[PDB]
Amino acid sequence: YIFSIVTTYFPGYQDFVNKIRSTIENSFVGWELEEVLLLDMSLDDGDSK
Amino acid sequence: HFTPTPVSYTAGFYRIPVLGLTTRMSIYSDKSIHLSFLRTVPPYSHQSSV
């Protein structure tokens, strides 16, 4: 009943998060997502980050 | 509106740069379809923002 999502750019990704956020709220069953993260993999030497 | 399109995606087929000079269309501003595209003149968005 609990999950968290993380993704990088390019696959028109805004639609994915928008759709999941729209669908999660309406239903009676109480999904409780926490700590959604956005990651940039194009960063040079961003391994420490 | 059609002339600068092929030099974008054909070059991006290997992801090699293309530098534009005086392109006015704002379609190429997207970072997804034309990730390897650059522009030298300002687009219409900022001349609207001014």
Q: What share of chain A is helix, strand, coil (3-state, %, to 5)?
A: 25, 10, 65
Resolution of this deposited model, Å: 4.3
- Count other Cβ atoms within 10 Å, centred on residue A38: 11
Type of residue at B25: M
Q: Mutate which of A10, A13, A40 to test chain B, going by most B C-beta atoms within 10 A? A: A10
Helices first, then strands: H and E counts in chain A: 1, 2
In which residue are the tokens 């379609």 written?
A: B27
User: Beta strands A37-38 and B18-19: pairing type?
Assistant: unpaired
Element (DSSP H or E) covering residue B8: helix B5-12
Tokens of A3: 């999950």
Contact predicate B18/B37, CB 8 Å: yes
Cα separation, A33 vs A20, whole angstroms: 11
B32 CB neighbours in chain A (<8 A) are: 9-10, 12
